[PDB]
């Protein structure tokens, strides 16, 4: 009861039309030749007619008419490829949610999966419960391997919401689509059952608030230099300040010197021109909220963040609970610091943007993210 | 199983309403009637009996063909262990070949540092020179 | 009054076939072409009686379509019932696996407590009871000195180190042993003839 | 005001104008962290540096002075590219004649980073080895006779008779890149040698359980065995 | 200031010679916890920081790579460092190594140097496993290949045959040949990583 690629599920044609209207002509022509070399139906002489239509400059409704009414849904494989190409094309409308992969003692486990033998084992373990279909591809721009799992049910076979799981190449952190049904738990548990093959793996979730794109969540939690720095420490995750030891020593930072503004340590901010000082103040805000140099949008836009600052004065426990919201939180705080509404010498580390897209209690000045 | 089918069959015959409405000219009918209504419940009781033996053996041989896809024998495991034994014998063979190459290098070194002679005389000369050097050093 | 005519025509065809099934044995009195040509007479008698019944008389409720819907419902019922039996078998297998894992964990915990309790009774007084900062300074002095200890042979669960069969499985170890013995004897003869331990000892 | 900090400046003016997360530009404090903390007992001193027209030659010599009695020196000579900075050539001018065969197979990797790190970790490992062995001298000179052997790689104790040899061999890499140590023991009860596998298991257990400095003292306590 | 420039040049070139070792410590202050005393005007740093600079020297291109930074901050109530920030990627368990060193509490500078040495050996073995396969690709003994980020799972071609390796720390632990005779060629290459170069020419002679 595992489904092959030639099986045709039941689906309305207007939703496949609205899916196909979101693609350019060249990927439609490539999908046409790929499905005709793979499946075919109604060798290369028929494909020579489509070569003139792209060369002439014809409308997209005609070519989606041509691809929808010579395969007259198409099947499960072409639907999976259409939806995956829509994922590649417009990536800022999905929503990913990370989950670390521990094992045994508690040490994390790098996945290192093979995209051929994993799909057979996952489809076999999922076929014992439902009617599954698993289609894995590799992202062209990023080094991830986005799996797409779609479960069917019987009243042909109706289609549920597809469930994506994006494995990075060498990280224990596996992203997946945000879903709280029983099908999300089934697919995630079957993935954690058939990725191991040697010793058992558990998928504990590392974050609760989902992140928007797949470039953003790969910058935050995938294998990258920005996985931990992410804030005012972003000058270390790109090496802006130091050259190689074999480099010239005339153009050294410690020989030319940098231009810095004398800080004020007396509280003379709450009681309140020379555009060198204005440029250095704007550069100081840019240094604090970013690396060293639009103009407010951070490296990763973060939507929802809420801290819990737990200080300790004269044997009391004084909690405050900040809770931010927006489209890009730390760019907005940069803008408020730029209108001279917030003192920049008193903005702490966790507010400037470090440990980005995380939220948790701050005891003794040490951040510790929520479980 | 059969105790339900026998009730369903013998509760639906001419043995349910004819024993209530029951000289000899009307007696030869309903005697031969229920006797020929006993021929149907004989050949069909053998039909419902033979069906469940056909049904349960088709279910038992299915269940025995499902457990042996999760259990192992002592013949395929022995063949797999023979294959693994051949693999480890090949690994030990190439390891022994590498050991043979390294001890051939040792044998090539072994005759390079030999000196077949009677060098205890020069050893005694070195001991006498050591005694003379100790005499020249301690008396200074 | 047309669906009733269709049902009566279907029942007429069925009853004509059922009457011909007895006429196949009731035609031995009168011959074989006197029944296949006389069947059209009695079939026209039912075709004229249905014609008179058509003038003696309405939803489109057919027997065959609703019987097909019954067969479809029964087939889907049997499919979902078989799926429930398969999921019952899967749940029974996973429950047995969970019980085996839990009894393994409880048995190993009980065996750990029993072995720790009997370890007190036995004699471990001088070299082991000085600790029983112990196994955590070895990792410091092993990632500090890059220590490679003589790694013992892996656990075999009472299959002892048969050195005869291991030595017979590698026939080059004996040749390496005797070659190393001749090499050590050659180097010892060269060292003792040079008096390396003699003149370096009296000098200092 | 607006100041321009430089490489040589006092720490207070550096800390007044500090709003970035960059390293401190004070070169004396940075050289102090590079010299006293991360690489102690090492005397690096650049001897000369010239240039051509586009490359920059650099002669620097090191003196690994962790052993104050007889430290070994080395002297390098490197050739830059000085923009799109690669390393063209590097050659060794003089080696003090102590590590010369040990740094013979090591110094043919054509990787100066591995040779520098391997020489520093080798002298650190040799200092730890002679410290552990001298600690075993100082706690056994009154009960046993204890003389060293080979160069320093195997301490030998003897009592009553019974002998015990504690090997400590440092193997330089060649045909990982850091030098590794090997500890093995061997007993003699007067007559003949014991089983090497049982002694290896006892040594592995007593070092895996206790340590290296306190682990071998337990091995000498078992090889005594007059009391327990 | 014309002799102070020469003194600064000597200090900078001595810093570069020390940075050639690979593992270096550099001073840090966090700009949040710089506090004034208000009795003398002098500025003291509240929580001390110490950063580690791990910069592996490549050999195939003969130039230093992008440096990896690890920054430790001193805990305010324990006097022991904790792993504040690090730019070491996620396939190296840096917090696991920092909890493994000295039990979990790092006090002295050599206790941090052991941690730096462990993460540096992992970075060097990743660089070496990438460089060996890239130098195999440069000599046309293997065809166009794909690598992982740590190059622990490669799939290169031979003249006809496709070979898949799962390679551990400078030794091959799992070979895979796909296209009785295949098993001998699979356990042939199952060895070290330079012996793989010795073996892939042993079949194409």
């Amino acid at each position: 009861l595992r489904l092959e690629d030639n099986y045709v599920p039941t689906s309305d044609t207007l939703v496949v039309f609205k899916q196909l209207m979101k693609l350019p002509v060249t990927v439609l022509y490539d999908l046409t030749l790929s499905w005709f070399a793979k499946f075919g139906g109604s060798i290369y002489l028929l494909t020579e007619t489509l070569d003139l239509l792209i060369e002439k400059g014809v409308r997209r409704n005609v070519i989606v008419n041509r691809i929808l009414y010579v395969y007259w849904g198409l099947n499960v494989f072409q639907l999976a490829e259409i939806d995956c190409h829509l994922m590649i094309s417009k990536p800022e409308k999905f929503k990913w949610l990370p989950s670390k992969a521990l094992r045994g003692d508690g040490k994390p486990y790098v996945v290192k999966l093979q995209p051929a033998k994993f799909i057979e084992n996952l489809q076999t373990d999922l076929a014992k419960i439902y009617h599954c279909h698993v289609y894995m591809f590799k992202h062209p721009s990023l080094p991830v391997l986005i799996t797409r799992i779609q479960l069917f049910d019987s009243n042909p076979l109706i289609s549920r919401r597809p469930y994506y799981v994006a494995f990075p190449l060498n990280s224990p952190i596996i992203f997946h689509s945000v879903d709280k049904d029983i099908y999300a738990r089934l697919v995630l548990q079957s993935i954690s059952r058939t990725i191991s093959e040697r010793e058992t793996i558990i998928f504990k979730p590392v974050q609760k608030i989902p992140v928007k794109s797949i470039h953003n969540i790969m910058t935050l939690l995938g294998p990258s230099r920005f996985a931990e720095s992410m804030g005012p420490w972003e000058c270390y995750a790109s090496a802006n300040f130091e050259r190689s030891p074999l480099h010239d020593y005339k153009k050294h930072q410690g020989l030319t010197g940098k231009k810095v503004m004398v800080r004020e340590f007396d509280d003379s901010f709450l009681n309140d021109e020379e555009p060198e000082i204005r440029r250095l103040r704007l550069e100081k805000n840019m240094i604090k909220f970013k690396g060293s140099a639009s103009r407010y949008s951070s490296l990763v836009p973060i939507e929802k963040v809420g801290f819990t600052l737990k200080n300790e004065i004269n044997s009391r426990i004084i909690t405050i609970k900040l809770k931010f919201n927006g489209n890009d939180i730390f760019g907005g705080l940069h803008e408020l610091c730029d209108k001279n509404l917030i003192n920049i010498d008193k903005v702490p580390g966790w507010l400037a943007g470090e440990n980005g897209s995380f939220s948790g209690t701050i005891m003794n000045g040490d951040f510790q993210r929520e479980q | 199983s059969e105790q339900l089918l026998h009730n369903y069959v013998s509760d639906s015959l001419l043995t349910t309403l004819i024993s209530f409405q029951e000289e000899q000219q009307l007696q030869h009918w309903y005697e031969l009637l229920q006797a020929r209504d006993a021929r149907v419940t004989s050949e069909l009781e053998a039909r419902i009996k033979q069906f469940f033996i056909t049904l349960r053996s088709r279910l038992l041989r299915f269940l025995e063909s499902e457990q042996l896809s999760h259990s192992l024998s002592l013949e395929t495991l022995i063949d797999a262990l023979y294959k693994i034994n051949d693999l480890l014998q090949q690994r030990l063979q190439i390891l022994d070949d590498a050991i043979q190459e390294k001890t051939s290098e040792l044998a090539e070194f072994e005759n390079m540092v030999r000196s077949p002679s009677a060098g205890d005389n020069a050893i005694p000369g070195l001991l006498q020179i050591i005694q003379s050097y100790i005499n020249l050093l301690e008396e200074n | 009054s047309i669906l009733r005519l269709l049902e009566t025509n279907t029942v007429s065809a069925l009853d004509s076939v059922f009457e011909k099934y007895e006429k196949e044995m009731n035609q031995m009195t009168h011959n074989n072409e006197v029944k296949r040509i006389y069947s059209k007479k009695e079939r026209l008698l039912e075709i004229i009686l249905t014609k008179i019944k058509k003038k003696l008389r309405e939803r489109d409720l057919d027997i065959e379509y609703i019987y097909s819907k019954r067969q479809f419902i029964q087939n889907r019922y049997s499919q979902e019932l078989q799926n429930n039996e398969r999921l019952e078998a899967i749940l029974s297998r996973e429950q047995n696996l969970l019980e085996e894992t839990r009894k393994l964990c409880m048995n190993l915990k009980t065996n750990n407590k029993k072995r720790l309790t009997e370890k007190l009774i036995q004699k471990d007084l001088h070299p082991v009871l000085n600790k029983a900062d112990g196994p955590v300074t070895f990792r410091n002095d092993s990632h500090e000195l890059n220590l490679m200890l003589n790694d013992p042979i892996k656990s075999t669960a009472d299959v002892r180190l048969d050195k005869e069969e291991v030595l017979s499985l590698l026939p080059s170890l004996k040749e390496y042993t005797k070659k190393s013995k001749e090499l050590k004897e050659t180097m010892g003869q060269m060292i003792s003839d040079s008096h390396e331990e003699e003149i370096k000892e009296v000098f200092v | 005001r607006v100041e321009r900090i430089n490489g040589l400046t006092n720490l207070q003016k550096e800390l007044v104008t500090k709003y970035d997360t960059l390293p401190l530009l004070n070169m004396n404090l940075r050289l102090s962290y590079l010299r006293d903390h991360t690489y102690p007992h090492l005397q690096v001193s650049v001897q000369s540096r010239d240039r051509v027209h586009g490359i920059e030659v650099l002669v620097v010599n090191y003196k690994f002075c962790r052993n104050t009695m007889n430290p070994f020196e080395i002297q390098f000579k490197m050739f830059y590219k000085f923009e799109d900075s690669t390393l063209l050539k590097w050659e060794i001018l003089r080696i003090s004649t102590n590590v010369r065969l040990k740094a013979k197979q090591l110094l043919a990797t054509r990787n100066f980073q591995k040779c520098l790190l391997s020489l520093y970790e080798f002298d650190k490992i040799k200092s730890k080895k002679t410290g552990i062995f001298q600690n075993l001298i100082n706690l056994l000179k009154r009960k046993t006779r204890c003389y060293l052997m080979n160069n320093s790689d195997s301490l030998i104790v003897e009592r009553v008779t019974i002998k015990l040899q504690i090997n400590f061999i440092i193997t330089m890499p060649g045909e990982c890149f850091l030098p590794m140590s090997k500890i093995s023991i061997a007993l003699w009860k007067g007559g003949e040698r014991f089983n090497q596998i049982d002694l290896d298991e006892i040594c592995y257990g007593l070092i895996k359980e206790y340590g290296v400095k306190t682990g071998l003292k337990e091995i000498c306590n078992v090889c005594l065995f007059p009391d327990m | 200031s014309t002799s102070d420039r020469s003194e600064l040049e000597d200090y900078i070139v001595l810093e570069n010679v020390y940075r050639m070792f690979g593992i270096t410590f550099f001073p840090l202050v966090d700009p949040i916890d710089l506090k004034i005393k208000d009795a003398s005007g002098e500025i003291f740093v509240d929580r001390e920081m110490l950063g580690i600079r791990l910069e592996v020297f490549s050999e195939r291109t003969s130039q230093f790579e992008k440096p990896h930074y690890v920054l430790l901050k001193k805990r305010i109530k324990s006097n022991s460092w904790f792993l504040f920030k690090h730019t070491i990627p996620s396939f190296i368990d840096v917090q696991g190594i920092f909890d493994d060193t000295n039990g979990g509490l790092v006090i002295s500078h050599d206790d941090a140097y052991l941690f730096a040495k462990r993460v540096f050996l992992q970075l060097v073995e990743v660089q070496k496993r990438r460089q060996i396969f890239k130098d195999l690709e440069a000599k046309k003994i293997i065809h166009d290949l794909d690598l992982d980020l740590e190059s622990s799972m490669v799939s290169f071609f031979v003249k006809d045959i496709k070979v898949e390796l799962f390679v551990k720390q400078n030794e091959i632990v799992s070979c895979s040949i796909l296209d009785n005779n295949k098993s001998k060629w699979e356990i042939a290459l199952l060895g070290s990583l330079d012996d793989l170069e010795l073996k892939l020419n042993h079949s194409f002679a």
């Binding site: - | - | 009457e19 419902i73 749940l91 | 160069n151 065995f225 | -």
Partner: protein, 171 residues
């Protein structure tokens, strides 16, 4: 309730026709009863078809209800299988099972070490030897001693060579 009225009308018409055929019946006599059997079969099968339509309707409603019950039990079994598999996976990869595993390993190591120590202290005083080399280490020491003897740079011939030239240098 048009089915009951159609049953009554068809039964009355076919019963009048069958009574007429029976009165006509009482090819000498074997011709008339064929139409009688045909009319009886038509009446019986028509009332059977109407009863079958009613019974099939109520049976299909009951079967749809029981199929809904079986689909509910299918969802129940799905949730039960998923929860049991989750507890199985959180049992084998838990801290307690791994902790008792390492405690068993440490107890086995301590037992084997103390057994070997007791046998060693036994063969010292109360109540082994070597005859083959299966794992030996007494060879690399002699080779290291020979290499440090015959070193052409430091050696022992060159340590004297840096003394006799240094003896005439003090003259």
């Amino acid at each position: 309730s048009v089915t009951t009225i159609d049953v009554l009308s068809s039964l009355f018409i076919n019963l009048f026709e069958n009574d007429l055929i029976p009165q006509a019946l009482k090819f000498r006599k074997l011709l008339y009863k064929l139409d009688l059997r045909l009319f009886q079969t038509i009446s019986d099968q028509m009332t059977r078809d109407l009863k079958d339509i009613l019974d099939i309707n109520v049976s299909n409603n009951e079967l749809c209800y029981q199929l809904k019950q079986v689909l509910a039990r299918k969802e129940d079994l799905n949730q039960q299988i998923i929860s049991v598999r989750n507890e199985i996976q959180e049992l084998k990869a838990g801290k307690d099972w791994h902790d008792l595993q390492n405690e068993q390993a440490k107890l086995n190591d301590k037992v084997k070490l103390n057994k070997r120590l007791n046998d060693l202290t036994s063969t010292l005083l109360g109540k082994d030897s070597e005859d083959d080399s299966i794992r030996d280490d007494s060879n690399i020491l002699d080779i290291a001693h020979f290499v440090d003897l015959m070193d052409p740079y430091n050696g022992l011939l060159k340590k004297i060579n840096k003394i006799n030239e240094n003896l005439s240098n003090e003259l």
